[PDB]
Design a protein around this nucleic acid. Structure first.
Lengths: 130, 198, 136, 80, 156, 83
RNA sequence: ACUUAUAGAUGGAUCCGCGCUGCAUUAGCUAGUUGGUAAGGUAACGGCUUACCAAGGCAACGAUGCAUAGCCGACCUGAGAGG
RNA sequence: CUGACGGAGCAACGCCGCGUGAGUGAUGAAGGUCUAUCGUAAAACUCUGUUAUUAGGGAGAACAUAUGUCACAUCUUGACGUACCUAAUCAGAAAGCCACGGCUAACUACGUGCCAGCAGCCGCGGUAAUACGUAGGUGGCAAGCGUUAUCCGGAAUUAUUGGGCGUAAAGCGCGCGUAGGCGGUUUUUUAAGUCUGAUGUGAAAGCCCACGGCUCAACCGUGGAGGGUCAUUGGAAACUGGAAAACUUG
């Protein structure tokens, strides 16, 4: 339980393998950031925040689209305690030529892969969710 | 230039590709050692080496001496495939090779033996030059032209763009390096300079 | 594929050994120990002629050469071609490595090479087992 | 061009100020990239004071004025 | 028309109660120069019209390259077993790089402009699969945003 | 002790040179820190005398004087005789 | 055209730093290991020989031994890390 | 004084500057693998100076107490000091190519009856070597033929970018288990660092570039790319980081 989000990350794609949703998951202050900034793009049925203390409970409720097909086709974290890879906000890579998105913490608040390119802010840029 | 004898080369290359030829005073089908037999089939490497059969006889575009501007301007503009076919005939030995003053294929390179010496530059009795924007093979230093080169002032007119013969020099060099159209017909691009890089 | 113990403990490469280990070498007498050289060119001076019979894959007959290199060791050769140099005691230009189908021999002869010229029954080869001044 | 505030901790000591301070830093190798932390030992000195059993301090790079020792600085954290 | 280039010409026999029976294993590439190619299981003992024997039954299985303008919009190194290929966008005149009969599913697609290499395998029974999966993971310029849930111009 | 030096990479076809402040006990070739440029003493390549000797003409009161027959280049100038 | 109170300078450098490779068939650690304390002196602090005393200073992390022992604009070269 | 630096038999060692045949030619013969092939082979006519009979050969460039009063200078700088050598110019040949099928790119066969023997991984002669002995050449070539062996992208057979676990060539005798790689939730006291940066903006011949002198190639140069936290330490506490606790069901 040392990474409070770790498996939970790909549990999106390892829960919606056949587009399925029966998986309730635990919280963070970034499990108040992991599932809250891609609803910016209509990606979740509901994660509004975690409503408990002690980093509790949360319905994952992963929105699925109109072609029936994996909203999250595949997904990896490349940022875990035990894998610390820190880069700048300039050559943040091209996430499938920009087809994917990133949602991550920065060195000046909280941003996305829509901010690093136009704000020069960020630290351990995390993943490629698609 | 020649390096041997040629005119059996109807079925070796296509043809020298910028004249009339010496092809068919005979059966021009069988290329070699096939006289009572079928044709030659297709490949890519059989294709590739057919390409360079029609490169090393077409011009004196000898290997280990010509690909070089292809890789040289591989830092300059465009996928260098047709750049090459316009990088092997954008010389004053080509802006004056279609100029029609030769009767041997070697006489567009030998247009200047004692023909066209000083094209705004120093007397150079050679095949080739460095044919930059507006670069000719122009009038001779202490002469103008000879009776083996000026004997064909416009021996065939309509000689290509950037070979616009303002005559008694027998060459035209209008603008720049040449758009590779007015040169071999059945040739390709990814089978001229996309066969060489491997 | 985990990188902690990777600077704690490293990995290897493959495992290969180069070609002709008792070759590319010139044996000392002053300081008694060999030279790791990989020289382009070298000599061969003869001790016997040599021939073994049992040949399966070809199943014709042809001999080879037993030429000793420097200063007391077994060095063995073969003459790949249709030319028989019924000779010995020569001083030559070595060819390094083995041709197909002879184990343990890695030392050969260039055409000409200061000892003889070659099997003079060749005139079309113009580049095999002795062939100089050949009309092209 | 001034002189740094090198710091550290202490391990042991011998008769009449054979003093020392620990040295360490954040950095990595060029090959297989892990955040493994690393150290090397130094040579400061006092009358007898900066010494074992708790001397979290600073050190210097100056004229040593010393045998093969090198430092004159002690800028502390605390004691035990 | 399909440029009906022979893919691969393979021999097996079946050992029997007598003299074993040979055959010739083959197919044909069926290339619109738009991105798809299918296959016909012309299981037989004839070499030249196995090409035709695949032109017969090919159209059961052809799948689309969701073409971008002489290119592909996103980058791929997939494989459905072993044979893998790497694909990217590129400037529309690039030089063409390819391996086997995937000179008939890269040079015969709505791209032609790549840096495409076959990562690892490059055989008559892996190049296809390699490129097949490469092309099965694609998408047009207006549809990620819906299984996503926005408009696509909401990524940059 | 200071003397003039020059650079070397690949051309001539006209007597060329360079301006620098190397050591005295050494050859024509020398190391240059503050590259001032080069010099063309071929009386033909006028577009090559872009030498901006700013630390080479500051040896006037530091330690310098025309030597080794190089006063011809300093003959056209006159940033000396300040003492 | 001599000798001096004085100089800009020359190789350097008194020296600081990262420059500064391999052998685990070499850890219970060298008596100076820890560093303070000398008459001394090199344009140069000071275990640098000596000056006074206590080592566990080490400590299973390479103490130490230890084998080629120049480096650095060069060259073939990668897409790039550079190698 | 050079023996520092210079003047060179030049090794076809580097590769180039280009020169040793022309206007060529009706298919053209006396035909050399095959039995129409390289034959548009040939001849005998003409074209270039550029190799060769000579010649004058002065390419660079500025040297110097007394000359009169460190800016500096004349009555003071041709061994190679002859080059660019147009130069009329005859015809002053550019050795010879490999395997000789198909891949490494190649063309067929008499010799050859397993006697010699072909063979860059694949691979060939026992009575048609579309391999060999040899013979006219098409794919590359003309200062070039087969070989000599070194790391490069290729070798993705290092895995810094680009490493398997049951199975190639691979998983714990495990109760045990120091160092430490990793090492709960939330706020965190940190104000170091990353966000990145004001600055220092200290030179480069050339840099991520290009170009100009040069019979173009051997031999030189503008440096706008600041010289790579270098001469100042930062503001974002979202945190590996001087580190106060609380949560508990794990």
């Amino acid at each position: 339980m040392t990474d409070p989000i770790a498996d939970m990350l790909t549990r999106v794609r390892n829960a919606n393998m056949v587009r399925h949703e029966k998986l309730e998951l635990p919280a963070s202050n970034i499990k108040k950031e992991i599932a809250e900034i891609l609803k910016s793009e209509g990606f979740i049925k509901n994660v509004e925040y975690v409503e408990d203390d002690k980093q509790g409970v949360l319905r994952l409720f992963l929105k699925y689209g109109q072609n029936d097909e994996r909203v999250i086709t595949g997904l990896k974290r490349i940022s875990k305690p035990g894998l610390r890879v820190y880069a700048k906000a300039s050559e943040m890579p091209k996430v499938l030529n920009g087809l994917g998105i990133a949602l991550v913490s920065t060195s000046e608040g909280v941003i996305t892969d829509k901010e690093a390119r136009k704000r020069n802010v960020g630290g351990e840029i995390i993943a490629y969710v698609w | 230039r020649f390096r041997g004898s040629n005119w059996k080369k109807s079925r070796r290359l296509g043809i020298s590709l910028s004249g009339t030829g010496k092809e068919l005073e005979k059966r021009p089908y069988a290329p070699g050692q096939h006289g009572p037999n079928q044709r030659k089939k297709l490949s890519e490497y059989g294709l590739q080496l057919r390409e360079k059969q029609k490169l090393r006889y077409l011009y004196g575009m000898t290997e280990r001496q010509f690909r070089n501007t292809f890789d040289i301007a591989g830092k300059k503009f465009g996928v260098h495939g047709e750049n090459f076919m316009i990088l092997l005939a954008s010389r004053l030995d080509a802006v004056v090779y279609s100029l029609g003053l030769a009767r041997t294929r070697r006489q567009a390179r030998q247009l200047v033996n004692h023909g066209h010496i000083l094209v705004d530059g120093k007397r150079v009795d050679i095949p080739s030059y460095s044919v930059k924007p507006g670069q000719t093979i122009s009038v001779r230093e202490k002469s103008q032209k000879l009776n083996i080169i000026v004997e064909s002032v416009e021996i065939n007119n309509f000689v290509p763009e950037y070979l616009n013969f303002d005559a008694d020099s027998l060459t035209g060099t209008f603008v720049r390096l040449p758009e590779r159209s007015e040169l071999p017909a059945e040739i390709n691009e990814q089978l001229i300079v996309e066969y060489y890089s491997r | 594929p985990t990188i902690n113990q990777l600077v704690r403990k490293p990995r290897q490469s493959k495992i290969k050994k180069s070609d002709s280990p008792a070759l590319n070498k010139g044996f000392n007498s002053k300081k008694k120990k060999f030279t790791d050289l990989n020289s382009p060119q070298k000599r061969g001076v003869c001790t016997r002629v040599g021939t073994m019979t049992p040949k399966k894959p070809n199943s014709a007959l042809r001999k080879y050469a037993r030429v000793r290199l420097s200063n007391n060791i077994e060095i063995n050769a073969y003459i790949p071609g249709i030319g028989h140099n019924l000779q010995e005691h020569s001083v030559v230009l070595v060819r390094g490595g083995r041709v197909k189908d002879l184990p343990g021999v890695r030392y050969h002869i260039v055409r000409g090479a200061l000892d003889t010229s070659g099997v003079d029954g060749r005139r079309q080869g113009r580049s095999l087992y002795g062939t100089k001044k050949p009309k092209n | 061009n001034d002189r740094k505030v090198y710091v550290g901790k202490v391990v042991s000591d011998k008769m009449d100020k054979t003093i020392t301070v620990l040295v360490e830093t954040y950095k990595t190798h060029k090959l297989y990239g892990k955040r493994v932390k690393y150290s090397k030992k130094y040579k400061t000195h006092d009358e007898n004071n900066s010494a074992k059993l708790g001397d979290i301090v600073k050190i210097q790079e100056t004229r040593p004025l010393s045998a093969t020792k090198r430092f004159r600085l002690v800028e502390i954290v605390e004691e035990s | 028309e399909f440029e009906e280039r022979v893919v691969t010409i393979n021999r097996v026999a079946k050992v029997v109660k007598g003299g074993r029976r040979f055959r010739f294993t083959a197919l044909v590439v069926v290339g619109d120069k738009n991105g798809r190619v299918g296959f016909g299981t012309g299981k037989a003992q004839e070499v030249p019209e196995a090409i035709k024997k695949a032109v017969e039954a090919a159209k059961k299985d052809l799948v689309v390259v969701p073409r971008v303008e002489g290119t592909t919009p996103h980058t791929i190194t997939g494989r459905y077993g072993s044979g893998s290929v790497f694909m990217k966008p590129a400037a529309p005149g690039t030089g063409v790089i390819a391996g086997g009969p995937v000179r008939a599913v890269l040079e015969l697609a709505g791209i032609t402009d790549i840096l495409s290499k076959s990562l690892g395998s490059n055989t008559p029974i892996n190049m296809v699969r390699a490129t097949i999966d490469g092309l099965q993971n694609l998408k047009n310029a207006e549809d990620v945003a819906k299984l996503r849930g926005k408009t696509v111009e909401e990524l940059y | 002790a200071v003397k003039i030096r020059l650079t070397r990479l690949g051309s001539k076809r006209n007597p060329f040179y360079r301006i620098v402040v190397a050591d005295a006990r050494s050859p024509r070739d020398g190391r240059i820190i503050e590259q001032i440029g080069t010099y063309n003493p071929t009386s033909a390549n006028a577009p090559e005398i872009k030498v901006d000797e700013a630390l080479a003409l500051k040896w006037l009161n530091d330690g310098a004087k025309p030597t080794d027959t190089v006063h011809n280049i300093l003959s056209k100038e006159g940033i000396m005789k300040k003492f």
